[PDB]
Amino acid sequence: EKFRERLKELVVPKHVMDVVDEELSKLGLLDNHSSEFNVTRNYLDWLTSIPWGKYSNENLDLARAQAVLEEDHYGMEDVKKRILEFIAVSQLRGSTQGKILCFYGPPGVGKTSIARSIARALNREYFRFSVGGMTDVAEIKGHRRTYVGAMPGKIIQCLKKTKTENPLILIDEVDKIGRGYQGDPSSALLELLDPEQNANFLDHYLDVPVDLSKVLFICTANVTDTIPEPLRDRMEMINVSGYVAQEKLAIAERYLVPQARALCGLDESKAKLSSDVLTLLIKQYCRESGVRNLQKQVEKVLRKSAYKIVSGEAESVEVTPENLQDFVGKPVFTVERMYDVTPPGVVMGLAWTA
Amino acid sequence: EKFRERLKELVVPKHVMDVVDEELSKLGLLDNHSSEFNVTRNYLDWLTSIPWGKYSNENLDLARAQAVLEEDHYGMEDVKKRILEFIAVSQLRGSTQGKILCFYGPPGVGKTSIARSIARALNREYFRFSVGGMTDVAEIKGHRRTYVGAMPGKIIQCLKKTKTENPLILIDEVDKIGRGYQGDPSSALLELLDPEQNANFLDHYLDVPVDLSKVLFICTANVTDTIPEPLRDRMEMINVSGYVAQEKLAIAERYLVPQARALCGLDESKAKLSSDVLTLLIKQYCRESGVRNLQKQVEKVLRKSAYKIVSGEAESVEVTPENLQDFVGKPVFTVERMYDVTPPGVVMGLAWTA
Amino acid sequence: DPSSALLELLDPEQNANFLDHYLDVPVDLSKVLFICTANVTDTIPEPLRDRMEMINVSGYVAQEKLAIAERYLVPQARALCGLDESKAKLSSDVLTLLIKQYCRESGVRNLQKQVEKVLRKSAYKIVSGEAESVEVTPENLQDFVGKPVFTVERMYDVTPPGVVMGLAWTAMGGSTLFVETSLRRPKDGSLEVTGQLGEVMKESARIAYTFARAFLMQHAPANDYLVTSHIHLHVPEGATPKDGPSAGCTIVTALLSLAMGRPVRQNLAMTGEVSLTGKILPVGGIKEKTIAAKRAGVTCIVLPAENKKDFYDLAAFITEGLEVHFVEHYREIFDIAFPD
Amino acid sequence: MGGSTLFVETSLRRPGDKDGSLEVTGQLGEVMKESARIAYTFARAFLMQHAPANDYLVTSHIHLHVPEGATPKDGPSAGCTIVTALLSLAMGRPVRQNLAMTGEVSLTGKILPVGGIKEKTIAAKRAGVTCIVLPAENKKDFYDLAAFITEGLEVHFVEHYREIFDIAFPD
Ligand SMILES: Nc1ncnc2c1ncn2[C@@H]1O[C@H](COP(=O)(O)OP(=O)(O)O)[C@@H](O)[C@H]1O
Ligand SMILES: Nc1ncnc2c1ncn2[C@@H]1O[C@H](COP(=O)(O)OP(=O)(O)O)[C@@H](O)[C@H]1O
C-alpha cells in the first residue's frame, strides 16, 4: 500500500506501471524471510523512488539569470553568452529543453565551478560524476538485477537524490578517457551524447527505459584532440581561456580570499589580505594559467592566521608582504623568464600544452 | 496462462512449441521461492517476447516511396535507387524480404538519417545499435542460462522491442569494430549477416533458432578498407559521397535551416537566412565534405537570433552577409589555397582521406 | 568498488540521516570526525580526491630513525620479546650502524624487523645459557642481523682527473653517482656514452658535450682537447638504469677536468641541469640528494640558485656541515671546482 | 642449475691513423655489450701506461665471443675477464692456468662487486680451479658461504684491476 501511494504523484509511463504491477504480484506471493523478497523489495523501492514526469521549475528570466551568473564568477563571457542564449531558446519553445555543452580549458580556471553557478541560475539540481580514466562500464548503468547486492547506475542514482527528471549533469575529464580492454564505457557516453539515443536510455538494473532528454549536460576537458571523434561530434565546444595577472587579483580579492576566509571560520575583521601581497603571491608563488594553486596558497595563509589568533600570538592577523614569508616560506618561482637579455642565437618562443 | 495468450496471437514454429511445452510443465513442478524459478521464468518470458511469425504491413507503393524518400533527403540517387529496387522486387515476390546493405562515405553525410527515412518509407520498425570499439562477443549472441545476470543478445532484444520479424536494424561503425585480444566479435557478426545462416540464428540464451531472414540489415561505415574481408564479402557496398558547395546550399536551404528553426522555435517571419549568408557560411566557415559542421553554424546563428528577440533588441532578426560576424564571428577558413601563384618548385596536388 | 557506500559516510547531508540497511531508524553522524590514510597518490580516487584534504607525510632520514628506535621501536620490541634492558643492551652507536647499513628505506617497518631479529637472537642465547647477558657491538651485529646491504658510500676517496661526484635520487634514499671520462683513442671528435642511461640523460650528455667544448674556446683557446680527441663517458653503475638531466653540470665538469688534466675538489658534489648556453636549471629531489652528500662525507655541495627554497626547506642537522653554493650559470661552478 | 663457467675468447679479425674496432658476438645483453665497450676502453688505456711500445689494442681489429653461442647472457660481471682476454691477446701471453675471475670493471679500472657469489664459487670448484679472483667488496659474501664450499680455493680479493694483472700474469 505504501509503495502504491508513493507513485500517485508521479507521471509514470505505461511500460513503468506493468513492470511495477508485475513485481507487486511477485512480492505478494513471496515470503517475508525470503532472500529474493528483499531483492524484489529493493528493486521495487528504486523504481518508485525514481521520479516519473516530475520536472523542476526552471528559471526563464534573462535579467535575474544574468545577474546571478555575474555575481558567482568573473569573466567567462563565452560561457555566459551561451547560457543566456539557452534560456531564450526555451522561451520560444515554451517547454524545457536539454543541450550537450563542453567546457575545455586549462585546469583550475573555473570549468567545474561555473556549472554549479549555472544550476542555481536555472533553478536546476546539480549532480557531478567524473570519468577520468574510466575502466568499468558498470558505473554508468549499474549491475544486473539478478546479481546479489546490485545497484543501479550513477545516472539512475542521480534521479533518486535529485528527485526530479530535469537535473544538471556534469562530466569531468572527457579528454582523460580510459581505454579499457575487458570493458569499454566509451560506448555508453556516445549513446548519451547522441540526442536521438539520449531520449531512450536503458540500464542493466532497470530494464525499463528512462527519458534522459531535456537534461542539460556539461562535460569538462583540457585539450580537445584526445576526445574521441564520435564524442567531439555531439559536443558543443565552449572555450574557457586562462587569466592574466590582473584578472587573477580580481578573482582572488573578490572570490578566493572571501571564500577561503569563510571555510576557515574567520570574518573580514580578523584576517586581512592586502592587494599587494596577493600580487606577490601571483607573480612569485604561482605559474599555472588557472587559480587552483593560488587558491591553495590563500587557504594555507588563512589556516596559519586562524592558528595564530587562537593560540595567543595575536588577535588580528594582517598579512603584509614583509611577513608573508612566515606564512608560506620562500618564493617558489623567482624568475618570470629564463633569459632577460637574449644572447645571439637565443630566441624566445611560445608553447601550448594541457 | 499469461504466457499462453502471448503465443496465441503469434504463429509459432513446431520446434519452439517443443521447448515452451516442456518448460511450461517444468514451472508447475518447480518451487516458487527457489533460485531456479527466476531463471526459468526469465527464459520463458523471453520466449513469449519473441514475435513468432509477426510481420509489419510493408509499404509496396512505389509512388509513395519516392515521395517519402524525396521529401526527407536531397540527392543520394544511388541509395534511393537501391530502395526503390528493393520495393519493386518485393512486389514481384508477393512477400517480404531481407537484404544486407552497407552505406560507406564521409562522416556527416546522411548515412544514419536516410536509414530512418527508409524505415518510414517501408513502414518497418527502426532499431539502431553500434559495434564501434566492441570487443565482447556475448553482446551479439548472449550467455547461457546457467550464468548469473545472463541476458540475450542484442538481436533478441530487437525483436522484443519492435514486436515484428521485419525491422530495419542499423549496425553503426562496422569499419571500427574493436579487435579482440581474446576473440574477434566480427566472427559472430558473420552468422548474423549470412543469408544461409540467417534462416536459423541460434544464440546462447535462446536455445531455439530464430528466422532472421526478411530483416533489412543496414551497416554504416566511413572507410571500406578497414572492414574485415569476410564481413565485407557478405555485404553490399553503396557509396554515399560528400556534396559540392552548390549541393550544400540546397541541403541547407530546404532541410537544415527549417529544421533548426523548429528546434529553436522561430517562425519564418522572425528569423531569416538569405542564400548569400548560407553560401558564405559554407565557403568560409565550414571546411568539410558533409553538412555536419554547417548544421552547427546554422544552429548558432538561429540561437543568437532567439536571444535578440527575447531581449527586445530586434523584433524580427534578418541575417545579412555584412552583419554575419555578429552571430558567428570572424571567418575561419579565409584562404582557399596556400599559393595563389606557385613559385618554381611548387606544384599543386590532390589528396583523399577518410 | 563500493565508493558510493563511502560517499554517504563523508557526505554531510547523509551524515545527519544515516539510512542503515540493517537499521531502519537513522543515526546522527554529523558530530563525527573522519580521518583517512593512503600510500601512493596515483591510484587514489580522483573523483573522491576533492573531498579529502591531501596531506603529505614524508619519511625519515637516519637521524629520526635513531630517535624513533631508541624511544619507541626498541622498548616496544623488547616488551613483545619478553627481554629486559639489563639482559639485552642495544647502544646508540650500533643502532646507527644498523640503520646506516641495513635499513635505508623511508619507512619504519623494516627497522622494526631488524631490531626484533637482534632481540630474538639474544633471547635464544639467554635461554640456551650461551651468555648470562647479551651485548651487541658493531662487529657482532653481522652475526645477529646478517648481510649488510650498504657497505661503501664513496667509490672514490680521492677523485682522479676526469671523475666528478654527482647526486642521484633513489627509492631507498639518496645515492652518489660518479661521472668518469677517459681517452678512447690516443678530423672530428666524438663522445661515446655507456651505462644504462635513459634518453633524457643521453641528450643531456650531448648538450653538456657541446657546452663544455664551447666553454674551452672562451677560456683556453689553445686547448684543442675536446675538439680533436675521442672521449668515453661512463657512469660506474652498469646494471642500474639511470635517467634525468640532473647530471648535466657534472658531465661538463668531468669533460673539463679531463681536458685540463686537473682533478676537481676532493669533497665536492654538484647537481643541476645545464642548458646549451650554460645556465643551470632547477632540479627536483633536493632532499634525497643532499642527505646522500652527508653520507658520502662531502663538505661543499653545488646546487642551482633556483633550488634555494628546497635546500632551506630542510632541517638544521641535515644541512649543518654543508657549505652550500647556489649558482645561476656554470661559470660560477667552474671557479668553485677549480679554485686555482 | 647450480651456476656455470664461461670463457671469453678473442682473436684478430684482420691481419695511417685508422684505429681498430671491437666486434662482440654471442647472445649478449645490452648491459653486457656496454660492459665490453667499457672494458675495451680501459684495456686500451691500461696498455698505454704498461707498455707504450705495444700498439695491438689501438690499430688491430679484435673479435670477441663467448662460446655458449645459443645461450643468452647479460650482466656486467664479465668486465674483468674481458679486459684480461684483450690484454692476453695483445701481449701474446696466456693467463695462469686454472684461474677464474669475475667482477664489474669501470673504465677507470676499479673492480665493483657482483651478485651470485655462491653460484660462481660452486661452479669454480666443479671445474676444479685452483685460484679465484673476486672484487674486494665481495669479501663478506665469500666468507659467508658454508665451510665445505671454500677449501682448496686460493681466493684473491681486489679493488683495482692492476692487482688482477699481476695475478693473471705473474712473470
Ligand atoms: N572567474 C572565477 N570567479 C570565481 N571563482 C573562480 C573563478 N575562476 C576560478 N574560480 C575558483 O577556482 C576554483 C577552480 O577549480 P575548478 O574550476 O573546479 O577546477 P577545474 O577548472 O580543473 O574544474 C573554483 O573553486 C572557483 O571557486
Ligand atoms: N542529402 C541530405 N538531405 C537532407 N539532410 C541531410 C542530407 N545529408 C545530411 N543531412 C543532415 O545532416 C546530418 C548528417 O548526419 P549523418 O550523416 O546522418 O550522421 P552519420 O554520418 O553518423 O550517419 C543529418 O542529421 C541529416 O539530417
PDB file of N, CA, C and O in Angstrom, chain A residues 22 26 29-31 34 36 62 82 84-85 88-89 91-93 99 144 146-147 181 184 190 196-197 233-234 236, chain B residues 2 33 38 41 116 128 130 133 135 148-149 151 161 173 262-266 292 296 303-304 306-307 309-311:
ATOM      1  N   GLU A  22       3.656  -6.055 -12.123  1.00  0.00           N
ATOM      2  CA  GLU A  22       4.010  -7.470 -12.102  1.00  0.00           C
ATOM      3  C   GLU A  22       4.930  -7.805 -10.934  1.00  0.00           C
ATOM      4  O   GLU A  22       4.834  -8.900 -10.367  1.00  0.00           O
ATOM      5  N   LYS A  26       4.529 -10.477  -7.688  1.00  0.00           N
ATOM      6  CA  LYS A  26       5.598 -11.360  -7.231  1.00  0.00           C
ATOM      7  C   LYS A  26       5.904 -11.132  -5.756  1.00  0.00           C
ATOM      8  O   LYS A  26       6.109 -12.090  -5.002  1.00  0.00           O
ATOM      9  N   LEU A  29       3.203 -12.859  -3.544  1.00  0.00           N
ATOM     10  CA  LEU A  29       3.253 -14.312  -3.442  1.00  0.00           C
ATOM     11  C   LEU A  29       4.515 -14.827  -2.762  1.00  0.00           C
ATOM     12  O   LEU A  29       4.627 -16.038  -2.542  1.00  0.00           O
ATOM     13  N   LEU A  30       5.460 -13.953  -2.427  1.00  0.00           N
ATOM     14  CA  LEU A  30       6.699 -14.375  -1.787  1.00  0.00           C
ATOM     15  C   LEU A  30       6.480 -14.518  -0.282  1.00  0.00           C
ATOM     16  O   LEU A  30       5.351 -14.480   0.217  1.00  0.00           O
ATOM     17  N   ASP A  31       7.569 -14.688   0.462  1.00  0.00           N
ATOM     18  CA  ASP A  31       7.538 -14.774   1.913  1.00  0.00           C
ATOM     19  C   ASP A  31       8.400 -13.669   2.509  1.00  0.00           C
ATOM     20  O   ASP A  31       9.321 -13.157   1.868  1.00  0.00           O
ATOM     21  N   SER A  34      12.261 -14.284   2.810  1.00  0.00           N
ATOM     22  CA  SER A  34      12.873 -14.790   1.590  1.00  0.00           C
ATOM     23  C   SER A  34      13.961 -13.837   1.113  1.00  0.00           C
ATOM     24  O   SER A  34      13.803 -12.615   1.171  1.00  0.00           O
ATOM     25  N   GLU A  36      15.036 -13.461  -2.013  1.00  0.00           N
ATOM     26  CA  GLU A  36      14.567 -12.778  -3.213  1.00  0.00           C
ATOM     27  C   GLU A  36      13.468 -11.770  -2.903  1.00  0.00           C
ATOM     28  O   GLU A  36      13.262 -10.836  -3.686  1.00  0.00           O
ATOM     29  N   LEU A  62      15.792  36.372 -18.263  1.00  0.00           N
ATOM     30  CA  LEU A  62      17.166  36.720 -18.614  1.00  0.00           C
ATOM     31  C   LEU A  62      17.780  37.672 -17.595  1.00  0.00           C
ATOM     32  O   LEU A  62      18.969  37.560 -17.273  1.00  0.00           O
ATOM     33  N   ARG A  82      26.379  31.812 -23.936  1.00  0.00           N
ATOM     34  CA  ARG A  82      25.695  30.585 -24.331  1.00  0.00           C
ATOM     35  C   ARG A  82      24.530  30.274 -23.399  1.00  0.00           C
ATOM     36  O   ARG A  82      23.467  29.832 -23.848  1.00  0.00           O
ATOM     37  N   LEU A  84      22.764  32.444 -21.588  1.00  0.00           N
ATOM     38  CA  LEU A  84      21.694  33.394 -21.876  1.00  0.00           C
ATOM     39  C   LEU A  84      20.953  33.013 -23.152  1.00  0.00           C
ATOM     40  O   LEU A  84      19.726  33.138 -23.226  1.00  0.00           O
ATOM     41  N   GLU A  85      21.683  32.547 -24.169  1.00  0.00           N
ATOM     42  CA  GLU A  85      21.033  32.049 -25.376  1.00  0.00           C
ATOM     43  C   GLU A  85      20.242  30.777 -25.102  1.00  0.00           C
ATOM     44  O   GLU A  85      19.220  30.533 -25.752  1.00  0.00           O
ATOM     45  N   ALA A  88      16.811  31.847 -23.688  1.00  0.00           N
ATOM     46  CA  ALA A  88      15.954  32.470 -24.692  1.00  0.00           C
ATOM     47  C   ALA A  88      15.332  31.429 -25.614  1.00  0.00           C
ATOM     48  O   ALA A  88      14.177  31.573 -26.032  1.00  0.00           O
ATOM     49  N   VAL A  89      16.084  30.380 -25.950  1.00  0.00           N
ATOM     50  CA  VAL A  89      15.542  29.311 -26.784  1.00  0.00           C
ATOM     51  C   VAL A  89      14.383  28.622 -26.076  1.00  0.00           C
ATOM     52  O   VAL A  89      13.357  28.307 -26.692  1.00  0.00           O
ATOM     53  N   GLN A  91      12.295  29.861 -24.021  1.00  0.00           N
ATOM     54  CA  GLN A  91      11.097  30.694 -24.006  1.00  0.00           C
ATOM     55  C   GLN A  91      10.312  30.568 -25.305  1.00  0.00           C
ATOM     56  O   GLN A  91       9.079  30.466 -25.281  1.00  0.00           O
ATOM     57  N   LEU A  92      11.003  30.584 -26.448  1.00  0.00           N
ATOM     58  CA  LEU A  92      10.315  30.434 -27.728  1.00  0.00           C
ATOM     59  C   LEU A  92       9.653  29.069 -27.844  1.00  0.00           C
ATOM     60  O   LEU A  92       8.521  28.958 -28.329  1.00  0.00           O
ATOM     61  N   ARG A  93      10.348  28.015 -27.410  1.00  0.00           N
ATOM     62  CA  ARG A  93       9.772  26.678 -27.464  1.00  0.00           C
ATOM     63  C   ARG A  93       8.564  26.551 -26.548  1.00  0.00           C
ATOM     64  O   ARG A  93       7.616  25.823 -26.864  1.00  0.00           O
ATOM     65  N   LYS A  99      20.501  20.337 -23.621  1.00  0.00           N
ATOM     66  CA  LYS A  99      21.592  20.502 -24.569  1.00  0.00           C
ATOM     67  C   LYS A  99      22.846  19.847 -24.012  1.00  0.00           C
ATOM     68  O   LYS A  99      22.974  19.628 -22.805  1.00  0.00           O
ATOM     69  N   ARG A 144      23.371  -5.953 -13.155  1.00  0.00           N
ATOM     70  CA  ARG A 144      22.117  -6.632 -13.436  1.00  0.00           C
ATOM     71  C   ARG A 144      21.372  -6.928 -12.138  1.00  0.00           C
ATOM     72  O   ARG A 144      21.974  -7.161 -11.087  1.00  0.00           O
ATOM     73  N   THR A 146      19.824  -9.469 -11.145  1.00  0.00           N
ATOM     74  CA  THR A 146      19.970 -10.806 -10.580  1.00  0.00           C
ATOM     75  C   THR A 146      21.182 -10.891  -9.657  1.00  0.00           C
ATOM     76  O   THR A 146      21.186 -11.683  -8.707  1.00  0.00           O
ATOM     77  N   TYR A 147      22.208 -10.082  -9.915  1.00  0.00           N
ATOM     78  CA  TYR A 147      23.399 -10.083  -9.076  1.00  0.00           C
ATOM     79  C   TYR A 147      23.048  -9.722  -7.637  1.00  0.00           C
ATOM     80  O   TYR A 147      22.227  -8.835  -7.383  1.00  0.00           O
ATOM     81  N   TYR A 181      40.032  -2.595 -21.764  1.00  0.00           N
ATOM     82  CA  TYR A 181      40.051  -3.778 -22.615  1.00  0.00           C
ATOM     83  C   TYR A 181      38.930  -4.754 -22.278  1.00  0.00           C
ATOM     84  O   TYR A 181      38.171  -5.157 -23.164  1.00  0.00           O
ATOM     85  N   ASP A 184      34.591  -1.402 -22.091  1.00  0.00           N
ATOM     86  CA  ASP A 184      34.743  -0.090 -22.722  1.00  0.00           C
ATOM     87  C   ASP A 184      33.509   0.755 -22.451  1.00  0.00           C
ATOM     88  O   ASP A 184      32.486   0.608 -23.144  1.00  0.00           O
ATOM     89  N   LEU A 190      28.747   7.696 -25.831  1.00  0.00           N
ATOM     90  CA  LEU A 190      28.318   8.001 -27.192  1.00  0.00           C
ATOM     91  C   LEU A 190      26.805   7.883 -27.331  1.00  0.00           C
ATOM     92  O   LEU A 190      26.173   8.684 -28.029  1.00  0.00           O
ATOM     93  N   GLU A 196      19.291  11.548 -30.345  1.00  0.00           N
ATOM     94  CA  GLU A 196      18.293  10.539 -30.683  1.00  0.00           C
ATOM     95  C   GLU A 196      18.352   9.360 -29.721  1.00  0.00           C
ATOM     96  O   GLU A 196      17.312   8.872 -29.263  1.00  0.00           O
ATOM     97  N   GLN A 197      19.559   8.886 -29.405  1.00  0.00           N
ATOM     98  CA  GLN A 197      19.703   7.802 -28.440  1.00  0.00           C
ATOM     99  C   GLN A 197      19.540   8.287 -27.005  1.00  0.00           C
ATOM    100  O   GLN A 197      19.253   7.481 -26.113  1.00  0.00           O
ATOM    101  N   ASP A 233      31.934  14.984 -31.872  1.00  0.00           N
ATOM    102  CA  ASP A 233      30.860  15.250 -32.823  1.00  0.00           C
ATOM    103  C   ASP A 233      29.639  15.853 -32.139  1.00  0.00           C
ATOM    104  O   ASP A 233      29.045  16.813 -32.646  1.00  0.00           O
ATOM    105  N   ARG A 234      29.251  15.308 -30.989  1.00  0.00           N
ATOM    106  CA  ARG A 234      27.997  15.659 -30.338  1.00  0.00           C
ATOM    107  C   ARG A 234      28.167  16.703 -29.241  1.00  0.00           C
ATOM    108  O   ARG A 234      27.197  17.018 -28.546  1.00  0.00           O
ATOM    109  N   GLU A 236      29.079  20.582 -27.995  1.00  0.00           N
ATOM    110  CA  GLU A 236      29.208  21.990 -28.353  1.00  0.00           C
ATOM    111  C   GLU A 236      30.417  22.550 -27.614  1.00  0.00           C
ATOM    112  O   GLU A 236      30.367  22.769 -26.400  1.00  0.00           O
TER     113      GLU A 236
ATOM    114  N   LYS B   2      -0.685 -16.686 -18.485  1.00  0.00           N
ATOM    115  CA  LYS B   2      -0.230 -15.410 -19.032  1.00  0.00           C
ATOM    116  C   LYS B   2       0.654 -15.614 -20.254  1.00  0.00           C
ATOM    117  O   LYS B   2       0.536 -14.885 -21.245  1.00  0.00           O
ATOM    118  N   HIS B  33       9.872 -20.206  -4.596  1.00  0.00           N
ATOM    119  CA  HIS B  33      10.901 -19.454  -3.889  1.00  0.00           C
ATOM    120  C   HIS B  33      12.316 -19.817  -4.320  1.00  0.00           C
ATOM    121  O   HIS B  33      13.257 -19.111  -3.943  1.00  0.00           O
ATOM    122  N   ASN B  38      13.523 -18.149 -10.848  1.00  0.00           N
ATOM    123  CA  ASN B  38      13.827 -16.892 -11.525  1.00  0.00           C
ATOM    124  C   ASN B  38      14.447 -17.137 -12.895  1.00  0.00           C
ATOM    125  O   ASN B  38      14.112 -16.451 -13.867  1.00  0.00           O
ATOM    126  N   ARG B  41      11.564 -18.647 -15.321  1.00  0.00           N
ATOM    127  CA  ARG B  41      10.562 -17.681 -15.761  1.00  0.00           C
ATOM    128  C   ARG B  41      11.169 -16.610 -16.658  1.00  0.00           C
ATOM    129  O   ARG B  41      10.511 -16.147 -17.596  1.00  0.00           O
ATOM    130  N   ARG B 116      16.645   6.039 -41.150  1.00  0.00           N
ATOM    131  CA  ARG B 116      15.346   6.261 -40.524  1.00  0.00           C
ATOM    132  C   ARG B 116      14.285   6.594 -41.566  1.00  0.00           C
ATOM    133  O   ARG B 116      13.121   6.206 -41.420  1.00  0.00           O
ATOM    134  N   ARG B 128      18.578   0.673 -33.913  1.00  0.00           N
ATOM    135  CA  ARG B 128      19.972   1.017 -34.149  1.00  0.00           C
ATOM    136  C   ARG B 128      20.825   0.588 -32.966  1.00  0.00           C
ATOM    137  O   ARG B 128      20.453   0.803 -31.809  1.00  0.00           O
ATOM    138  N   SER B 130      25.366   0.068 -32.126  1.00  0.00           N
ATOM    139  CA  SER B 130      26.710   0.305 -32.625  1.00  0.00           C
ATOM    140  C   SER B 130      27.627  -0.859 -32.278  1.00  0.00           C
ATOM    141  O   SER B 130      27.420  -1.564 -31.286  1.00  0.00           O
ATOM    142  N   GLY B 133      34.307  -0.017 -31.556  1.00  0.00           N
ATOM    143  CA  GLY B 133      35.046  -0.274 -30.331  1.00  0.00           C
ATOM    144  C   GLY B 133      34.480  -1.405 -29.506  1.00  0.00           C
ATOM    145  O   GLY B 133      34.486  -1.332 -28.273  1.00  0.00           O
ATOM    146  N   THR B 135      34.395  -5.411 -28.293  1.00  0.00           N
ATOM    147  CA  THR B 135      35.370  -6.481 -28.117  1.00  0.00           C
ATOM    148  C   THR B 135      34.728  -7.780 -27.645  1.00  0.00           C
ATOM    149  O   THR B 135      35.239  -8.866 -27.938  1.00  0.00           O
ATOM    150  N   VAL B 148      24.902 -16.264 -13.966  1.00  0.00           N
ATOM    151  CA  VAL B 148      24.098 -15.266 -13.271  1.00  0.00           C
ATOM    152  C   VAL B 148      24.169 -13.949 -14.030  1.00  0.00           C
ATOM    153  O   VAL B 148      25.217 -13.579 -14.575  1.00  0.00           O
ATOM    154  N   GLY B 149      23.044 -13.243 -14.086  1.00  0.00           N
ATOM    155  CA  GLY B 149      22.988 -11.996 -14.834  1.00  0.00           C
ATOM    156  C   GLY B 149      23.232 -12.173 -16.316  1.00  0.00           C
ATOM    157  O   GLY B 149      23.949 -11.369 -16.926  1.00  0.00           O
ATOM    158  N   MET B 151      21.931 -12.128 -20.073  1.00  0.00           N
ATOM    159  CA  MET B 151      20.928 -11.543 -20.945  1.00  0.00           C
ATOM    160  C   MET B 151      21.122 -12.033 -22.375  1.00  0.00           C
ATOM    161  O   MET B 151      22.242 -12.365 -22.775  1.00  0.00           O
ATOM    162  N   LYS B 161      11.518  -5.476 -28.697  1.00  0.00           N
ATOM    163  CA  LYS B 161      11.120  -4.072 -28.738  1.00  0.00           C
ATOM    164  C   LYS B 161      10.228  -3.785 -29.941  1.00  0.00           C
ATOM    165  O   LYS B 161       9.172  -3.156 -29.809  1.00  0.00           O
ATOM    166  N   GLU B 173      29.082   1.941 -37.414  1.00  0.00           N
ATOM    167  CA  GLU B 173      30.526   1.849 -37.188  1.00  0.00           C
ATOM    168  C   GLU B 173      31.023   0.409 -37.322  1.00  0.00           C
ATOM    169  O   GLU B 173      31.680  -0.133 -36.430  1.00  0.00           O
ATOM    170  N   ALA B 262      12.743  25.015 -36.208  1.00  0.00           N
ATOM    171  CA  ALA B 262      11.817  24.304 -35.334  1.00  0.00           C
ATOM    172  C   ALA B 262      12.474  23.953 -34.006  1.00  0.00           C
ATOM    173  O   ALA B 262      11.836  24.026 -32.949  1.00  0.00           O
ATOM    174  N   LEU B 263      13.750  23.560 -34.041  1.00  0.00           N
ATOM    175  CA  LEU B 263      14.464  23.247 -32.808  1.00  0.00           C
ATOM    176  C   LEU B 263      14.585  24.476 -31.917  1.00  0.00           C
ATOM    177  O   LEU B 263      14.389  24.391 -30.699  1.00  0.00           O
ATOM    178  N   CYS B 264      14.908  25.629 -32.505  1.00  0.00           N
ATOM    179  CA  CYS B 264      14.995  26.859 -31.729  1.00  0.00           C
ATOM    180  C   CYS B 264      13.620  27.421 -31.395  1.00  0.00           C
ATOM    181  O   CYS B 264      13.451  28.050 -30.344  1.00  0.00           O
ATOM    182  N   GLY B 265      12.634  27.210 -32.262  1.00  0.00           N
ATOM    183  CA  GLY B 265      11.303  27.735 -32.039  1.00  0.00           C
ATOM    184  C   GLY B 265      11.107  29.111 -32.639  1.00  0.00           C
ATOM    185  O   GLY B 265      10.582  30.014 -31.981  1.00  0.00           O
ATOM    186  N   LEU B 266      11.524  29.283 -33.891  1.00  0.00           N
ATOM    187  CA  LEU B 266      11.433  30.558 -34.584  1.00  0.00           C
ATOM    188  C   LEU B 266      10.614  30.402 -35.857  1.00  0.00           C
ATOM    189  O   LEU B 266      10.783  29.432 -36.602  1.00  0.00           O
ATOM    190  N   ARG B 292      27.599  18.488 -41.662  1.00  0.00           N
ATOM    191  CA  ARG B 292      27.544  18.415 -40.207  1.00  0.00           C
ATOM    192  C   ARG B 292      28.022  19.708 -39.558  1.00  0.00           C
ATOM    193  O   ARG B 292      27.350  20.251 -38.676  1.00  0.00           O
ATOM    194  N   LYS B 296      25.933  23.011 -37.336  1.00  0.00           N
ATOM    195  CA  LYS B 296      26.272  23.694 -36.090  1.00  0.00           C
ATOM    196  C   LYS B 296      26.274  25.206 -36.270  1.00  0.00           C
ATOM    197  O   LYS B 296      25.813  25.943 -35.392  1.00  0.00           O
ATOM    198  N   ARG B 303      20.267  30.430 -32.797  1.00  0.00           N
ATOM    199  CA  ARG B 303      20.268  30.533 -31.343  1.00  0.00           C
ATOM    200  C   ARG B 303      20.535  31.962 -30.891  1.00  0.00           C
ATOM    201  O   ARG B 303      19.895  32.456 -29.955  1.00  0.00           O
ATOM    202  N   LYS B 304      21.480  32.643 -31.541  1.00  0.00           N
ATOM    203  CA  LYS B 304      21.751  34.035 -31.198  1.00  0.00           C
ATOM    204  C   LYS B 304      20.607  34.948 -31.616  1.00  0.00           C
ATOM    205  O   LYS B 304      20.348  35.956 -30.949  1.00  0.00           O
ATOM    206  N   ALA B 306      17.452  34.151 -31.501  1.00  0.00           N
ATOM    207  CA  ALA B 306      16.416  33.996 -30.487  1.00  0.00           C
ATOM    208  C   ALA B 306      16.709  34.854 -29.262  1.00  0.00           C
ATOM    209  O   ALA B 306      15.789  35.400 -28.643  1.00  0.00           O
ATOM    210  N   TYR B 307      17.986  34.973 -28.892  1.00  0.00           N
ATOM    211  CA  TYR B 307      18.349  35.807 -27.751  1.00  0.00           C
ATOM    212  C   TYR B 307      18.010  37.269 -28.004  1.00  0.00           C
ATOM    213  O   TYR B 307      17.538  37.971 -27.103  1.00  0.00           O
ATOM    214  N   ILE B 309      15.629  38.432 -29.934  1.00  0.00           N
ATOM    215  CA  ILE B 309      14.180  38.605 -29.925  1.00  0.00           C
ATOM    216  C   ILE B 309      13.657  38.695 -28.496  1.00  0.00           C
ATOM    217  O   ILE B 309      12.834  39.559 -28.172  1.00  0.00           O
ATOM    218  N   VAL B 310      14.128  37.805 -27.618  1.00  0.00           N
ATOM    219  CA  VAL B 310      13.675  37.820 -26.229  1.00  0.00           C
ATOM    220  C   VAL B 310      14.117  39.103 -25.537  1.00  0.00           C
ATOM    221  O   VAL B 310      13.338  39.738 -24.815  1.00  0.00           O
ATOM    222  N   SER B 311      15.370  39.506 -25.747  1.00  0.00           N
ATOM    223  CA  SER B 311      15.893  40.710 -25.117  1.00  0.00           C
ATOM    224  C   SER B 311      15.232  41.982 -25.629  1.00  0.00           C
ATOM    225  O   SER B 311      15.410  43.041 -25.017  1.00  0.00           O
TER     226      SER B 311
END
